[PDB]
Structure formats: structure tokens, C-alpha cells
Amino acid sequence: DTVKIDANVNYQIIQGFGGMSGVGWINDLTTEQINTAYGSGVGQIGLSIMRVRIDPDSSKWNIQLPSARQAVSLGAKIMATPWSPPAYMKSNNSLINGGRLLPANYSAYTSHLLDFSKYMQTNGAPLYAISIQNEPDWKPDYESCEWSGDEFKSYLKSQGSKFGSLKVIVAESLGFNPALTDPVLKDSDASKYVSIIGGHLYGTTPKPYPLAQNAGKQLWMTEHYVDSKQSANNWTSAIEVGTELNASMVSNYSAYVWWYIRRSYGLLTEDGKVSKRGYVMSQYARFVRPGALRIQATENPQSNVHLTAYKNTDGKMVIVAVNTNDSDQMLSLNISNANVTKFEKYSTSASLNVEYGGSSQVDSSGKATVWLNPLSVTTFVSK
């Protein structure tokens, strides 16, 4: 059915796609694995964001440097998340099962975070962004710390100015619950120090956040994974990554950051090879590059077809479509306000990994017909 595209109507800017560096909790990435994930060529995923954990013990920070340095060398931006302040700053004197950061320690905690930023920077892996807390609404039996949105608000009013040009992220809610961040965004004295509203998708689905958008903050999805009991090469499950990426983009997110890059259910499997989930991610990350603008395009032209469209800074139009029908699907593109004469097709499916599927001509009235293979994630790139 018909898809109407207007390259003169813009939504969010895309900062990129990322994953978690897990060294300290799991084995480090190798240099080869980072090059595969952070390169953007054939066979590579195209990530450009790496997330790192801030250990409350600063004697352990050094183990983060090899992977963070390699990523920066390859053009990536680093964001850092703390799971807990040091135990001795919290109300329960423990790293685990929550506990509150004592207000008397707000300046000390800021100094801890800034120390981490200076260490990284001095060692040649400068941070782009820093989060105040991981999942303040979750109190598991590992590093965690509980906060309310009013506590974030008080914290930021007193400490926020100290972060300088570092981009501050709040609140990394488990389920992207606005309750944690609305108090911050409704207070201009707190809001002025926040650059990014970040959240996770556990137990939820992507949704727009109008208050964050109207406040001019970017929205980043800073951690998720799908059904970890599945092999990353199970196609039935991997296509769900495509669904979630599409929903995230339609929800005006500027960044999407997976959990552990290398894992049995990850973007790379434990043999260091790209997985089906990684190829799905690459249908977005290799082609929708940092700086791209999402543009108007019929999102659900027909049953079980979802798509988004982008203009890259180099002038290329890109269309990324998810087809969860077990049948070939035709799209009738109608493009306005663009200078496109052909699209190249690249698909991931049960049997293809980002494989070229031929070219389609766009007539001089901006019309083209393209086809989606069954149960596939397909990217069209203008030439």
C-alpha cells in the first residue's frame, strides 16, 4: 500500500546506536570485537555509543580504559552510568538492595562522578554524557541506589552547575516512568542542568514523552535487551529487536543503547561473530548515521509493516521497514520535497544478513515500488 514521505517535515536528530561495555562484571571485549561493533562497513554493526559503569571503588576504574579508548578511537561517544554510590555515602551503608544517597553527601557524590570523568579524560577516553543514577526505581541484590524525582530535583539544583559541558542524564528509570523525571522538568532551576532524559524499557514499550521534548531535552533509551533465554541467532526472537527499534524511533528517541554487546543473547555471540540481533541493529546503525534527521513517513502503511525514514547529513535518504508478515509485501512510495532517483535494498531475514536485494527507480514525480521479503528488516538507501 501507499507510503507518503515528506523530507521537509523533521522529527528528532539521531545521535546513534550503542551497547554496554561489561568489563568488571563480564569478560572484556577484545579489540577485534570492538572494531566489528563500532566500524560501519560490511560485516560491522555501526554502533557509535558505548556505555560504561562507574564502579564505586575507584581502584577499579582502570579496567575500563582499553575498551573505552578503542571506542573513542573509532569515533564513538562514551556515556557513563553509576549503579551505586560508595556504601558509606548511603543510608543503609551497603552497595545493594537500594539505600538512599544521604543529602549531606550530595557534594561528595558529585566529586566522585567528576573524578571519574577527569580520570577518563586524562587517559584519552573523554566522556560525552554522565548519568546520576541507574534505575532509581529498582532495588535488587546488586549495586543499586534509590531516589525519588524530588531528590533528583534537589540534587540538580545544588550540584548541576558543576558538571559543566558534560551532558547530564536523568533518571534511567527501569521502565521509563515519567514520575521520576517530571519533577525535574517542571522546575526550571533543575531542568536547565539536564541535557538528556534517559530511560530503560523493562516491562514496557517505547512511548513519546511530550514534556521532555517540549523542554528541548533529547530522549535516550540507555539500556534494554529482549528475551535473554533465546540464542541471539533465533530469528523468531531477533525480529522483535526490529519491532522495538522501530517503536523507539517513532517515539522520538535520539539514541538506543543495548545491554552487553557480546553475550549469548547479544549483538555479538561468544565466538565474537555478529548475531542476527546484531544484523538487525546494523540495518539501522550502519545506514542511519549520527546527525540524521527522522522525517515524515507513513508508519504503518499496511498490517504488520512498520517503517521510519531519515535524511542523513550527506543527503542520503534512508527507509527502514519491519515486515512481520510471512509474505512478500509491496510498498508504493510517494516522496515529496526530495532529490532521489533510486534506492538500494538491503535485507536481514532468517536467511539473509544485510544482503543486497537490487535497486528501484524513483520516477520524476517521486514514485517508486519496493518489496519487502517475508519476516524481514529491510533498509532502502538512496544512491
Residue spans per domain, the chain? 1-14+291-383, 15-290
The DSSP annotation for 293-359 comes to EEEEE-S-SBTTEEEEEEE-TTS-EEEEEEE-SSS-EEEEEEEES----EEEEEEESSS-SSEEEEE
SS3 (DSSP) at 28: coil
Is residue 50 packed enough to be buried (19+ CB in 10 Å), middle (13-18) or exposed (0-12)? buried
Give yes or no: 143 in active site: no
Other Cβ atoms closer than 10 A to 382 = 19
Tally the residues of the chain.
Answer: 383
The verdict on domain 1-14+291-383 having CATH code 2.40.50.140 is: no
Q: What method was applied to determine this entry?
A: X-ray
| Cross-strand pairs, 101 | 90
Rg (C-alpha) for the chain, rounded Å, is 21
**Cβ count near 258 (within 10 Å):** 28
Strand order through the sheet with 293-297: 355-361, 342-348, 376-382, 317-323, 305-311, 293-297, 2-13, 329-336, 367-372
Catalytic residue among 143, 223, 240, 244: 223
Say how many Å lie between the first and final Cα of the chain, rounded: 23
| All three cell numbers of 217 | 531535552
- Ranges of H-type helices in the chain: 31-38, 65-73, 106-122, 149-159, 182-185, 188-191, 210-214, 235-250, 276-285
Residues 6+ apart with CB under 8 A from 88: none
CA–CA gap between residue 353 and residue 347 (Å, rounded): 7
Is the distance from CB of 278 to CB of 267 less than 8 angstroms?
yes
- 362-375 burial: b if 16+ Cβ within 10 Å, else e: beeebebebebbeb
Domain 15-290 architecture: Alpha-Beta Barrel (3.20)
Can 344 be counted among the known catalytic residues? no
Out of 135, 146, 151, 244, the active site residue is 135
d(CA 119, CA 114): 8
Instruction: Give the span between the Cα atoms of 137 and 200, in whole angstroms.
Output: 11
Q: At what angle do helices 31-38 and 65-73 cross, to 10 degrees?
A: 40
Contact 293, 63 (CB under 8 A): no
Residue owning grid cell 542511519: 288
Q: Which of 120, 99, 5, 141 is nearest to 51 (CA)?
A: 120
Place of cell 562484571: 25
- Non-local (6+) Cβ contacts of 155 within 8 A are 101, 106, 132, 147
Same fold, 1-14+291-383 and 15-290: no
d(CA 160, CA 146): 19
User: Cβ(160)–Cβ(168) under 8 Å?
Assistant: yes
The x, y and z cell numbers of residue 264, run together, are 549469548
In the three-class reduction of DSSP (H, G, I as helix; E, B as strand; rest coil), residue 58 is classed as helix
Residue whose C-alpha cell reads 560508595 in the numeric block: 86
Instruction: Describe the crossing of helices 276-285 and 235-250 by its angle, rounded to 10 degrees.
Output: 30
> What is residue 103's DSSP assignment?
G
